[PDB]
Amino acid sequence: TSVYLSELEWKSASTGYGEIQKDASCDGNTITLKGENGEKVSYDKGIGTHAHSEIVYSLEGLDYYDYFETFVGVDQEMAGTVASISFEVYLDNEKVFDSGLMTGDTTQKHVKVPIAGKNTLKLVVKDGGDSIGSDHGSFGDAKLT
């Protein structure tokens, strides 16, 4: 029914600080994002990364799936910091999602884009236009469905 991105191997990957963490935040904690009702939300699966980050996945041999789905936001390990980022999703060189500026307490966003007839998925986490300081971006429950 679904395959998580952390169960797949990227073609290429980069991160601005530390290393990309599969099923964990940048600092190796459970991925947490700010909920819509004041809560801290935990995600068992996903990708923890840091601005500036770019990750590219091939969708070859994955024709079973209709959508790419993920939550995005500043990882809540960095709550109450200078954290400021944006998330961009690309499918075949076309931008299909842009989060805009997200800071420490910005409510998580919920991505769902159709992947039929698509070959390449690209994830971008940018630095909010100031610096990469505190810029822990997490992709919560990142999967193909």
Ligand X SMILES: CO[C@@H]1O[C@H](CO)[C@H](O)[C@H](O)[C@H]1O
Site of interaction with ligand X (CB under 6 A)? 17, 132-135
- Nearest alpha-carbon partner for 18 in 140, 141, 138, 128: 138
Please report how close the Cβ of residue 82 comes to Ca ion at its closest, in angstroms.
Answer: 7
User: What residues make contact with Ca ion under the rule CB under 5 A?
Assistant: 84, 127-128, 130, 135
Binding partner of 17, given Ca ion, ligand X, none, CB within 5-8 angstroms per partner class: ligand X
Please report how close the Cβ of residue 11 comes to ligand X at its closest, in angstroms.
Answer: 25
How much of the chain is helix, strand and coil, in % rounded to 5? Answer: 5, 50, 45
- Between residues 135 and 141, which has the closer beta carbon with respect to ligand X? 135
- Between residues 28 and 100, which has the closer beta carbon with respect to ligand X? 28
Taking CB positions, which residue lies at the least distance from Ca ion? 128
CB-side neighbour CA atoms (13 Å) of 14 = 9
Measured at the CA of 128, the angle between CA 136 and CA 107, to 5 degrees, comes to 65
- Between residues 6 and 134, which has the closer beta carbon with respect to ligand X? 134
Cβ atoms of 31 and 23 closer than 8 Å: yes
